[PDB]
Amino acid sequence: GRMHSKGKGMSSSAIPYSRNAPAWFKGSSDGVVEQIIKYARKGLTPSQIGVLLRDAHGVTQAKVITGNKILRILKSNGLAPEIPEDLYFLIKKAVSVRKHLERNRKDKDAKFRLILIESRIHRLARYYRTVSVLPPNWKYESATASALVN
Amino acid sequence: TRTSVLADALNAINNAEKTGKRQVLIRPSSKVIIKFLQVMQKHGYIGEFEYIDDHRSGKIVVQLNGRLNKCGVISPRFNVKIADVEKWTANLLPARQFGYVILTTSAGIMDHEEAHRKHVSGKILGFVY
Amino acid sequence: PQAKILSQAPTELELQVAQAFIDLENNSPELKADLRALQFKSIREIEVAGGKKALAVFVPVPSLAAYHKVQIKLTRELEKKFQDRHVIFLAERRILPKPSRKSRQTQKRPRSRTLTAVHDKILEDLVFPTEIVGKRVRYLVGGNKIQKILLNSKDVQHIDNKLESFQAVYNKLTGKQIVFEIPS
Amino acid sequence: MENDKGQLVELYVPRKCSATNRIIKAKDHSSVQINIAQVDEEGRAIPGEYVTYALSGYIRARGEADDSLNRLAQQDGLLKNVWSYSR
Amino acid sequence: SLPSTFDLTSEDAQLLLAARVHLGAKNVQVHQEPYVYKARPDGVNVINVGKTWEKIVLAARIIAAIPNPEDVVAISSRTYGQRAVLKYAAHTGATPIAGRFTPGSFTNYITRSFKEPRLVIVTDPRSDAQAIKESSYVNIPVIALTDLDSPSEYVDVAIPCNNRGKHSIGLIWYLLAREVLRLRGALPDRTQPWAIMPDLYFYRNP
Amino acid sequence: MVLVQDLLHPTAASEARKHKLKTLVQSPRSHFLDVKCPGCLNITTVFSHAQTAVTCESCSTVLCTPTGGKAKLSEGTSFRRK
RNA sequence: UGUCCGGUCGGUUUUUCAACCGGAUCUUUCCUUCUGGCUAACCUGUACUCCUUGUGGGUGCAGGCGAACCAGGACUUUUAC
Numbered sequence: 001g002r003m004h005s006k007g008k009g010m011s012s013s014a015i016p017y018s019r020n021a022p023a024w025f026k027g028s029s030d031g032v033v034e035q036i037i038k039y040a041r042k043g044l045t046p047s048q049i050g051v052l053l054r055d056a057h058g059v060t061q062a063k064v065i066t067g068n069k070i071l072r073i074l075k076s077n078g079l080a081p082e083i084p085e086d087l088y089f090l091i092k093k094a095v096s097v098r099k100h101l102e103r104n105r106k107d108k109d110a111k112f113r114l115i116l117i118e119s120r121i122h123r124l125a126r127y128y129r130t131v132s133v134l135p136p137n138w139k140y141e142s143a144t145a146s147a148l149v150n
Numbered sequence: 151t152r153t154s155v156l157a158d159a160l161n162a163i164n165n166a167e168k169t170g171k172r173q174v175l176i177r178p179s180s181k182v183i184i185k186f187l188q189v190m191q192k193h194g195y196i197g198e199f200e201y202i203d204d205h206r207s208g209k210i211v212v213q214l215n216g217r218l219n220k221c222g223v224i225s226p227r228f229n230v231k232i233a234d235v236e237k238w239t240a241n242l243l244p245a246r247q248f249g250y251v252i253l254t255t256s257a258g259i260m261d262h263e264e265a266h267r268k269h270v271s272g273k274i275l276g277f278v279y
Numbered sequence: 280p281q282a283k284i285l286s287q288a289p290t291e292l293e294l295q296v297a298q299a300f301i302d303l304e305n306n307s308p309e310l311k312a313d314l315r316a317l318q319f320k321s322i323r324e325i326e327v328a329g330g331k332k333a334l335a336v337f338v339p340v341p342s343l344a345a346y347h348k349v350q351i352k353l354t355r356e357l358e359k360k361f362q363d364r365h366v367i368f369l370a371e372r373r374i375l376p377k378p379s380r381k382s383r384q385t386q387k388r389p390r391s392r393t394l395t396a397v398h399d400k401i402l403e404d405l406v407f408p409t410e411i412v413g414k415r416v417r418y419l420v421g422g423n424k425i426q427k428i429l430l431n432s433k434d435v436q437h438i439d440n441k442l443e444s445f446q447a448v449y450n451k452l453t454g455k456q457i458v459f460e461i462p463s
Numbered sequence: 464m465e466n467d468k469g470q471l472v473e474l475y476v477p478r479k480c481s482a483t484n485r486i487i488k489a490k491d492h493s494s495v496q497i498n499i500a501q502v503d504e505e506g507r508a509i510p511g512e513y514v515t516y517a518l519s520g521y522i523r524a525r526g527e528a529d530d531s532l533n534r535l536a537q538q539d540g541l542l543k544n545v546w547s548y549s550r
Numbered sequence: 551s552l553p554s555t556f557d558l559t560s561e562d563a564q565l566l567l568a569a570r571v572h573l574g575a576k577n578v579q580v581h582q583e584p585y586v587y588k589a590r591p592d593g594v595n596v597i598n599v600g601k602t603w604e605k606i607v608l609a610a611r612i613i614a615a616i617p618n619p620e621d622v623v624a625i626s627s628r629t630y631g632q633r634a635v636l637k638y639a640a641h642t643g644a645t646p647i648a649g650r651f652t653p654g655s656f657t658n659y660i661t662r663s664f665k666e667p668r669l670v671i672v673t674d675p676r677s678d679a680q681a682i683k684e685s686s687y688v689n690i691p692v693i694a695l696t697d698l699d700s701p702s703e704y705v706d707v708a709i710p711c712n713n714r715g716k717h718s719i720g721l722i723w724y725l726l727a728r729e730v731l732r733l734r735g736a737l738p739d740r741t742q743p744w745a746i747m748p749d750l751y752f753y754r755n756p
Numbered sequence: 757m758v759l760v761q762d763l764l765h766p767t768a769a770s771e772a773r774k775h776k777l778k779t780l781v782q783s784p785r786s787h788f789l790d791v792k793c794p795g796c797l798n799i800t801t802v803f804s805h806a807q808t809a810v811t812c813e814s815c816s817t818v819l820c821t822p823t824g825g826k827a828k829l830s831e832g833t834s835f836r837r838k
Numbered sequence: 839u840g841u842c843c844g845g846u847c848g849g850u851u852u853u854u855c856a857a858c859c860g861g862a863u864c865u866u867u868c869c870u871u872c873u874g875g876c877u878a879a880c881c882u883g884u885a886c887u888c889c890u891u892g893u894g895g896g897u898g899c900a901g902g903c904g905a906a907c908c909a910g911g912a913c914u915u916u917u918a919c
């Protein structure tokens with residue numbers, strides 16, 4: 001019921017019944033893949049790409065039409081970033097928080113938030129390590145965090 | 151987290167029975183759960199039950215007969231060494247005569263009597279009396 | 280093209296099917312072309328309980344897509360050709376079984392090939408360009424699994440009369456008793 | 464219950480509620496026997512012939528009782544249009 | 551099972567409509583009641599009529615099934631329907647209770663008004679509630695005339711009806727009486743509006 | 757809702773009322789509104805909850821402004837359903 | 839094991855029946871696989887008949903069903919229960 005806050009909501013995407021294609025909504029799988037690749041090249045993250053596909057074009061999910069997801073496709077092509085997207089975002093957030101703290105020494109809530117973010121990042125990092133995406137003996141923290149980010 | 155899905159289901163069923171409902175809706179719907187339900191049916195504690203295919207995990211509906219009294223689930227799946235079975239039964243079930251202690255084992259998910267007949271016990275799941 | 284577009288061709292029924300296909304091709308706008316990129320792995324015959332009969336014609340699987348891209352018209356043609364019998368362009372699926380604890384690792388199975396999965400795939404195939412909304416499965420008091428298929432109310436013109444036959448076919452394939460249903 | 468070879472032991476073999484199945488106890492002061500007279504053609508309620516229903520007390524207490532009764536009636540064939548299967 | 555004869559006569563339906571047995575209930579609504587037939591907008595609910603009729607019939611049948619007639623204890627506290635209740639009692643010999651119920655009537659075997667029913671009948675389980683409770687102490691069936699905001703705890707065979715009141719309750723009572731008469735009695739036919747009148751019942755001018 | 761609901765088949769109204777999640781099967785009630793702009797004669801399969809400043813296929817016309825839920829279709833624009 | 843008679847000199851042997859616990863298999867199905875030892879067996883058919891009018895029955899050996907056992911590889915997903 002949420003990781004960090006005490007807010008237990010279900011703001012959530014439903015997903016339709018048919019694993020098979022929504023008949024009429026046409027195009028091609030290959031075309032979709034190409035589009036995704038292009039997006040990746042441009043700079044759009046997998047989620048972003050998916051959103052784009054949903055909004056203007058007739059795509060519902062890549063999982064449906066291609067068979068494969070988006071991240072997987074990117075990997076196959078050679079386009080998934082070194083740091084996975086969510087993790088990267090988290091890191092960025094942490095960095096921002098750190099910066100804010102530096103700017104304004106006296107700020108307790110902010111500090112707490114930063115700490116929380118860091119913890120989250122650590123968790124994520126650990127998970128990644130367990131999986132085998134990010135190589136082991138590697139902490140994504142604070143001083144080098146900035147460097148990692150940019 | 152949703153720990154012991156089966157346990158949750160059992161609890162729900164119990165609640166329904168207490169209420170005086172004629173039927174229950176169960177969310178997760180496992181293999182183990184299904185087995186348990188089947189066992190219950192065999193014994194004579196439950197009507198029809200139907201697995202909905204949420205193109206996903208599962209979702210069961212059970213027809214309650216008004217015969218169930220408790221449909222319990224023991225917590226960690228304790229390792230039962232055949233002689234201990236009797237003890238377990240004594241602890242849980244009312245009367246030497248009737249009721250069952252649904253325990254998984256090598257052979258399958260079965261009641262205590264069945265296990266005895268087989269000559270094969272294992273880890274407990276629940277009970278029905 | 281008699282004993283050619285059939286992967287391995289021994290039987291009379293298969294030959295007949297081939298002949299029919301050839302005849303169909305005789306037309307030749309795109310149908311012929313489609314036929315040229317289509318074959319059968321084998322054919323299997325199911326006796327439906329009530330006069331009619333069912334033809335589970337097995338397809339490789341890579342050609343399944345091609346069949347689908349045509350299918351309905353082709354199916355209709357086949358029906359016209361061979362009276363008193365329904366046709367199902369079914370897929371020949373493998374079913375590499377579950378390995379035991381002691382048994383040998385055949386470099387793992389795919390979950391595409393798992394028995395249940397295979398069955399599901401077959402079901403999907405067999406019911407036409409119509410699409411399943413969902414499935415109930417009823418476990419009855421005696422102890423009989425009865426699958427109950429909810430069909431999507433759009434179209435439902437091809438399936439309408441074939442439901443029993445389809446069920447029979449499914450039973451033959453698997454053993455499970457299927458039933459069909461349509462919501463309002 | 465059944466000693467040796469039949470010989471039914473244990474008297475007072477209880478009324479079980481129509482709606483719930485739930486045993487109606489000896490001092491279940493709330494539980495009720497409804498008697499519904501048997502219908503015939505053109506008036507006529509057939510003297511000395513009923514569909515008898517037992518309702519347990521719990522149900523009555525709840526207020527789920529009337530509905531249950533209605534359902535039972537529907538099942539029997541004492542009503543039409545009243546109790547629907549789905550709500 | 552059923553005769554398939556009594557399918558609610560048109561005239562009866564009309565009468566009911568006039569009474570506004572089915573324009574009652576209002577905004578307020580109970581989860582144990584599916585006797586509605588479409589919500590009329592802004593502070594209204596419309597009641598399904600056929601269902602009500604069926605319920606009434608059932609109640610009548612139940613009443614008939616009681617053999618000893620001086621037994622069907624009709625009750626009414628609230629003023630609009632007392633008269634109706636009295637009328638009903640007069641029609642079909644079963645000692646009623648107009649006005650005050652007296653607690654310890656069905657229990658408490660010393661009381662002057664110690665009834666002992668085998669079938670209780672009520673108008674408003676919101677008001678007569680006490681009576682219902684009393685009945686529940688000693689194993690008696692309860693028939694009652696539910697508005698869709700009235701509680702149905704220890705109630706059976708709840709005839710749905712408008713308990714704003716005035717015409718409606720009385721009308722319902724009359725209908726019930728008629729039904730009772732039909733099921734074993736003088737009246738052998740569902741047809742003929744007959745020598746009685748609805749307006750024998752109803753609340754009177756004080 | 758009491759005792760004997762008979763839970764496999766509800767009336768559709770109930771389903772509609774309940775959360776897009778809290779029915780029998782999960783099924784969304786968002787739609788691919790096939791929008792036509794006033795300019796070019798071409799149809800954009802616009803998902804009703806855009807989350808984006810939805811341009812046309814090429815021309816910078818602006819079809820739908822993404823409000824938190826369903827998108828407000830910018831100006832006098834015409835649309836088909838799904 | 840209850841049944842159906844004790845078919846029997848209070849005990850025993852089948853059938854009319856039973857539930858219960860296995861085993862082999864066939865079902866889109868491998869139970870670990872082979873390099874060889876024994877191939878028990880007939881899937882056999884080489885002479886066809888000791889012989890009630892017969893597919894009741896076996897002296898009998900080139901192709902060859904191996905589970906009837908070994909004796910060695912190959913390598914075992916590993917546990918817990």
Ligand SMILES: [Mg+2]
Nearest residue numbers: 001008009010
């Ligand atoms: Mg939650």
Ligand SMILES: [Mg+2]
Nearest residue numbers: 002003004005
């Ligand atoms: Mg925490």
Ligand SMILES: [Zn+2]
Nearest residue numbers: 796812814815
């Ligand atoms: Zn344009």
